[PDB]
Amino acid sequence: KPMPLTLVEQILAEFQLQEEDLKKVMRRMQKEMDRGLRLETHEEASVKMLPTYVRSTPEGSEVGDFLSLDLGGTNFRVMLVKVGEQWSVKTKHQMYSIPEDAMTGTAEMLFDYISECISDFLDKHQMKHKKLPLGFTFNVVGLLRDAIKRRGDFEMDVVAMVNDTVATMISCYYEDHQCEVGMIVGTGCNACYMEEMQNVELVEGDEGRMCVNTEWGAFGDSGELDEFLLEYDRLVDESSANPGQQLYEKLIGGKYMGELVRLVLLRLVDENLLFHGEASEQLRTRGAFETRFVSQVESDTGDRKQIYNILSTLGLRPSTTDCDIVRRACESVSTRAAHMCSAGLAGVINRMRESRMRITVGVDGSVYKLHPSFKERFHASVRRLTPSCEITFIESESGRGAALVSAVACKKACMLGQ
């Protein structure tokens, strides 16, 4: 690395977060999860800790057979699943490519094509009498119900989807049975984990555990993060659709990460430390610096070409120094996102530890998967904040994890009386 520009470093250093800071954030998250878990304070609690009814014991034994529907980009998978016995997950499936016609009509006309494919599948395997439960993997539930009803020839119960943190936990559990935490760092950020039943005051029972959906994005309503906010965070918060809300997520989520960078670049520019104090009209446009650009700038192999090309797309003609500064502005934001995020997962893992540590954590999300070194910085920060825990991280990815998600969602549904 070259000797950095001092003036720039003083501005980017404002993003730094010390251990003592993250422990502050951690402890504040912890008290907020306590408020969420308890009957008495749950309604005013901003971190809701939603019981998911996904228990540590297999329930809904009378659901052995079901249909799993993995809805993807340009196609979908229909999959028949039979659960037996550890659970014996038997599957057969079919890939269906969505025609361009079906893609480009309306959402209702789309799900009629999906329903049509389901009919063919059931005919192919002689199951059009069986009235199977159907889960979704990746209001489409509503659309499929209406599209099946519209057909009338076969009957089918489309169950409620699980939260994406829960699906991540369940599909990662398939491959590593030590997984008891699900986490998403994409557009938004959330976490779920297996809580002790005695702590889940909203569902009575002492025995076993239940997944709890933290919905921790809402953390910060009472100013729990105020001392750690910066002018740019405040600006993002004011221009957003929901000012004063989702403050924790605003620091971390992919939804705003690009906008934060853009604002940092404008500060630098206005300080005459970047682009000779001259921004483009694109750069002065809200939303122009896409979050994908951040990962791209931080992927640059050292030759400045991915950075140059991105900045050129915004109507800038950057010097080599300008490209270095952008990289460092991107890293500041990323690394701060990773810190803030690690403080949340640390509060969860330390809370789980008190009740008892080798533990696996399932993770998903574009930021965690695709941002060059978010995961690395994130891992190291959590491990630091969680002494006496050994944390294995895995990413969700033959379609049997998805089948296990759909089995749980259907069995949950049976258990709750539909």
Ligand SMILES: CS(=O)(=O)N1CCN([C@@H](CC2CCCCC2)C(=O)Nc2nccs2)C(=O)C1
């Ligand atoms: C027999 S098994 O080894 O295949 N197996 C997987 C399923 N589960 C949990 C879900 C898991 C989800 C991940 C964390 C631990 C519970 C489970 O099925 N929970 C349910 N809650 C409501 C309906 S079903 C089990 O208890 C054990």
Ligand SMILES: OC[C@H]1O[C@H](O)[C@H](O)[C@@H](O)[C@@H]1O
């Ligand atoms: O998609 C990740 C997360 O984004 C948002 O925070 C949603 O509120 C939450 O339900 C979801 O788990």
